[PDB]
Amino acid sequence: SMNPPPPETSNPNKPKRQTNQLQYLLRVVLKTLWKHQFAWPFQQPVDAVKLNLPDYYKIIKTPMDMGTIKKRLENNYYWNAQECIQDFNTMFTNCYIYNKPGDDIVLMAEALEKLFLQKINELPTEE
Numbered sequence: 001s002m003n004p005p006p007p008e009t010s011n012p013n014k015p016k017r018q019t020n021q022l023q024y025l026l027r028v029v030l031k032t033l034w035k036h037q038f039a040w041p042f043q044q045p046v047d048a049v050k051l052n053l054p055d056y057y058k059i060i061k062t063p064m065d066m067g068t069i070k071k072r073l074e075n076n077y078y079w080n081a082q083e084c085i086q087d088f089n090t091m092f093t094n095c096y097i098y099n100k101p102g103d104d105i106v107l108m109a110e111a112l113e114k115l116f117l118q119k120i121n122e123l124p125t126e127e
């Protein structure tokens with residue numbers, strides 16, 4: 001069995017900038033979800049080899065995890081907040097697509113997604 005390479009977190013060809021919205025996404029949103037008791041399955045790519053999930057990367061074609069998001073934010077990989085918000089929504093969506101309702105990992109994603117929603121509701125206006 002083999003894992004795919006992870007999503008890129010560095011690419012000099014990609015336009016990027018610092019925004020106050022991206023600063024919020026690191027200092028408030030990522031920091032809140034990372035420290036949560038349910039963060040740990042989401043803090044690095046799914047290891048489909050060690051978890052014995054040989055179908056995972058047949059069903060999940062756009063993988064994403066908060067380890068990737070954290071490096072993207074710390075490396076200033078994004079152009080705008082919408083790109084980073086899309087990564088969070090991909091991560092949650094992938095968990096719901098692969099798993100079934102009421103599975104423990106779905107309850108964990110739901111608890112993280114509720115905090116995510118509460119924090120991005122107060123995303124600051126761009127300066």
Ligand SMILES: Cc1sc2c(c1C)[C@@H](c1ccc(Cl)cc1)N[C@@H](CC(=O)NC[C@]13C[C@H]4C[C@H](C[C@H](C4)C1)C3)c1nnc(C)n1-2
Nearest residue numbers: 040041042045046047051053094095098099103104105108
């Ligand atoms: C490190 C990761 S990543 C990750 C899991 C783990 C352990 C993780 C997980 C699981 C439980 C907790 Cl508390 C927590 C997490 N889940 C995986 C998906 C997965 O293994 N599915 C297989 C089954 C796991 C269980 C339940 C069903 C019946 C049995 C036993 C097999 C399905 C997964 N998906 N998305 C992500 C992200 N994960």
